[PDB]
Structure 1
Amino acid sequence: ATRISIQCRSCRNTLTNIAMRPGLEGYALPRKCNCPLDPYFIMPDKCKCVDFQTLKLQELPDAVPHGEMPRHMQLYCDRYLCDKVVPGNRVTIMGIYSIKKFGVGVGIRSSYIRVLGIQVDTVSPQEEEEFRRLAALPNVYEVISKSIAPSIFGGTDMKKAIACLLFGGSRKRLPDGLTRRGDINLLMLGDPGTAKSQLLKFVEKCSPIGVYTSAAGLTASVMRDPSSRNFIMEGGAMVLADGGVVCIDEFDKMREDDRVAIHEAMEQQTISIAKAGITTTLNSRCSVLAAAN
């Protein structure tokens, strides 16, 4: 509330146009109506309001004197500074270092920084043609499969196939709603000789969405939460990868339960756990690039 208006209760006397002060400080309603002691209430119909957020600013990482956890400060944004920054940004605040007035020690106050200035630190038509002509050129196939594994060399078939998984087929819906897959799966069997970890890292890096996994797990779990003392649901990786690609190594190391669930997930393309208090479904839409041993 910025411009507030009150009213008496018994005699119905009004005292309007009262202006609040900015920042985090309230207001002291009278008690001398001119009627019982504090006869004044707020009229909700007549009170102009403005938005306000409240952020939390942590100090840069390269300025901690390196013995402890960085300290942080509290901000107070206003009408047009709200919804301007997202947790994870770098900023430069110009504010009025001040104190809360909502009236460990005897005379201690709280403190914030009333922000009044903020900063942030950092497809095309013609681009379409370098895709068009490249798709149209006669030897369009090998030009990609040549530049998708520079370090590792030998047997371009194992690189020929990987070219398709990055594009994939198309998702069809028959009249019956009986949809069809739109992704592929690959297994690279053979000794672990570290020649394949490079390839996993590459395909993960050059993917629109992609995750390389060896935590919570791959598929969903049901875990007894300390706070709730009850079971909660943990969607793992294959529910976060939407259309993306998931890379896996050492296909015999994954937890027995987890391997069962990944089997069913590649079977049906969704994970549905029916356990203690959990009956949900999570659509798994990703691509499995597995490496065996």
Structure 2
Amino acid sequence: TVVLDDVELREAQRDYLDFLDDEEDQGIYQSKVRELISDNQYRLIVNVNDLRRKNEKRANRLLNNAFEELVAFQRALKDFVASIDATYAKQYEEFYVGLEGSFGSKHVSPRTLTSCFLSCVVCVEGIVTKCSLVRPKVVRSVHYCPATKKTIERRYSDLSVYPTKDEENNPLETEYGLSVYKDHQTITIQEMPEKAPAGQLPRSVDVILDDDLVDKAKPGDRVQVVGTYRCLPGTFRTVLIACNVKQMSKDAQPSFSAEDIAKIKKFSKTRSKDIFDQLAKSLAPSIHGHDYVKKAILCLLLGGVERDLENGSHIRGDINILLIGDPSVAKSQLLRYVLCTAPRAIPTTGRGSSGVGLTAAVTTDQETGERRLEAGAMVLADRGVVCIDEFDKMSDMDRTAIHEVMEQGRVTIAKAGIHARLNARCSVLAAANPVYGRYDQYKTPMENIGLQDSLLSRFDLLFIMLDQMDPEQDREISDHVLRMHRYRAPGEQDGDAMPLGSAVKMVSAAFMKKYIHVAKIIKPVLTQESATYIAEEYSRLRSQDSMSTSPVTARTLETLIRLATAHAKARMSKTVDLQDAEEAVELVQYAYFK
């Protein structure tokens, strides 16, 4: 009852060996395997498109039938490595194969990863939300029987199981050195928050990582995993066995369409001087006034340029803004507009995401009693924006945690015996209404809310917006509010209001989002004239500090540099200009001097 030989498996193995046997051709894969041997790794990365070119039928077989074809490919790879080098092949029991390249339809996202892909190779792209501790897993256990002087072996693989006694009840003692254990980890992948409609429910796919793939992923990392999607033993829980995991750049690029790029270029070249002013005016048309606040929010959206030095320093290019003001002001409305406009922004409150809070957390699953490092809102906001409401109501533990992310942009957690240092570089836009309302211009903003004044130091811009009872200002605000409320759509007959739906100069909000997303890619650089001007302006600000907001210091200098870079991005200029520096300087003057 044992398969003597298989023709299909032999054919597949020989074909894969021929493919890897790249010597009569460019030799790309032979060089790859040689470099693999030299590097001591044991996972070859294979471009599926090359296999399709060499043999479309073989690639189709591999994609449609994953387990058997990959087993044959691994066999062929091990044979080829042995042929090139026998001792190295003997060093490692098995050599794995990792796929790569374009996948016609198997390239999906967790939302679109339907059950029809079971047993098919898939290329799932998403955001890592939960990770498990690296744990050894026995794949082959060797036992010894002194009574019978007999060594037995057992394989578990995909298949009280742990043998302990001989068939005659003679004790068996394990041979730990001979047995085979491989490191094993489990993670979860979800669709990118930006491109994930709210109507649908969350779609999370589990991923299993083994060997070198174990630690090549962390929570809050946008990763593409190519693997085999299989059903666990029995309703059938489904998991994806990872063949290769690659972290894709979080910045990515605005693919959009050539028409959108042309429109953006035309808009930029139309009036570069006033482009920032027009965007600020159109940022939140429903809100009247607060012009400088809108400009600062736009600067935050565009963000500065992160500088990394040879000494490992990571001077942050993000811009953090805090809004303090009496209730019944557009703070929350401004945050909503930022969410609707920012290319990649995530909302949150002082409490933060339930359980995980704002930053990452360690949670016992409580379904199997297993620890999991779950990413928080701040971590998922990496290289994006986090809009915090009721920032004052943040918990004390979160009050301490936010410090590390604000300072260095990375959150470190060692509690529960779990070590992790997750990237959390994210511009933060927080709004906190003063305690007991009715902000008093006597106490410090710290004493008005309570922040320890260290967070106030961390935030680049702190805008105090008070509900002054000026009849002229009140008339302007009331006129704007009533004009907005009376506004009727271009097509309507003064009839019914918008029907209840089951689905959730001035530039369009979507167009503004696209434009800022395109602009964010630019990497403007300083100019000597701009450097001298900013130095002179900083000296002037220090001088004005003589009279007795927070004092002007080097933090203000870096804030000015970041604002100048952001406004340079607004115009798409590859080099900052005196206009950008002047705009940043006047904005800072307004922020620190009403």
Question: Structure 1 length normalisation: TM-score?
Answer: 0.60
Shift, 1:220, TM fit: 1.0
**What is the rounded CA distance, in whole Å, between the counterparts of 2:108 and 2:370 in structure 1?**
36
Any conservation in 1 of the 2:405–2:425 contact (CA below 8 Å)? no
Q: Deviations over 1:29-80 (max 9, x none)?
A: xxxxxxxxx46534231469724379xxxxxxxxxxxxxxxxxxxxxxxxx9
Counterpart check, 1:256 vs 2:396 = yes
Counterpart check, 1:139 vs 2:255 = no
Root-mean-square deviation (Å): 2.9
**What is the rounded CA distance, in whole Å, between the counterparts of 2:427 and 2:297 in structure 1?**
11
Shift, 1:157, TM fit: 1.4
Counterpart check, 1:171 vs 2:306 = yes
Q: CA 1:226/1:205 → structure 2, altered by over 3 Å: closer, same or farther?
A: same
One-letter amino acid of the counterpart of residue 408, structure 2: Q
Which position in structure 2 is the counterpart of 1:223? Answer: 363
**What is the rounded CA distance, in whole Å, between the counterparts of 2:275 and 2:303 in structure 1?**
17
One-letter amino acid of the counterpart of residue 236, structure 1: G
Identity of aligned residues (%): 45
Q: CA 1:171/1:40 → structure 2, altered by over 3 Å: closer, same or farther?
A: closer
Q: Deviations over 1:210-263 (max 9, x none)?
A: 011122311011222214534321210111123111001112322321221112
- List aligned pairs for 1:60-99, cutoff 5 A: 83=106, 86-89=109-112
SS class of match (2:379): coil
Q: CA 1:140/1:221 → structure 2, altered by over 3 Å: closer, same or farther?
A: same
Which position in structure 1 is the counterpart of 2:266? Answer: 130
One-letter amino acid of the counterpart of residue 281, structure 1: R
Structure whose residues are more often strand by fraction: 1
Shift, 1:183, TM fit: 0.6
**What is the rounded CA distance, in whole Å, between the counterparts of 1:84 and 1:251 in structure 2?**
40
Counterpart check, 1:156 vs 2:291 = yes
Q: Deviations over 1:257-290 (max 9, x none)?
A: 1221112211111000111221111011111100
Any conservation in 2 of the 1:183–1:286 contact (CA below 8 Å)? yes
- List aligned pairs for 1:180-219, cutoff 5 A: 180-193=315-328, 195-214=330-349, 215=354, 216-219=356-359
Q: Deviations over 1:171-221 (max 9, x none)?
A: 222332322110111111023326221110111111111011122311011
SS class of match (2:383): strand
Question: Structure 2 length normalisation: TM-score?
Answer: 0.31
Which position in structure 1 is the counterpart of 2:182? Answer: none
**What is the rounded CA distance, in whole Å, between the counterparts of 1:166 and 1:85 in structure 2?**
29
**What is the rounded CA distance, in whole Å, between the counterparts of 1:53 and 1:45 in structure 2?**
16
Flag structure 1 segments of 5+ consecutive residues without an equivalent: 1-37, 55-79, 94-122
**What is the rounded CA distance, in whole Å, between the counterparts of 2:338 and 2:388 in structure 1?**
11
Which position in structure 1 is the counterpart of 2:4? Answer: 41
**What is the rounded CA distance, in whole Å, between the counterparts of 1:271 and 1:208 in structure 2?**
23
Counterpart check, 1:52 vs 2:64 = yes
Any conservation in 2 of the 1:173–1:180 contact (CA below 8 Å)? yes
Shift, 1:86, TM fit: 4.6
Shift, 1:150, TM fit: 0.6
SS class of match (1:226): coil
Q: CA 1:184/1:39 → structure 2, altered by over 3 Å: closer, same or farther?
A: closer
**What is the rounded CA distance, in whole Å, between the counterparts of 2:365 and 2:420 in structure 1?**
17
Counterpart check, 1:269 vs 2:292 = no
Flag structure 2 segments of 5+ consecutive residues without an equivalent: 14-57, 67-102, 117-256, 434-594
Q: CA 1:90/1:143 → structure 2, altered by over 3 Å: closer, same or farther?
A: same
Q: CA 1:228/1:166 → structure 2, altered by over 3 Å: closer, same or farther?
A: same
Shift, 1:143, TM fit: 1.2
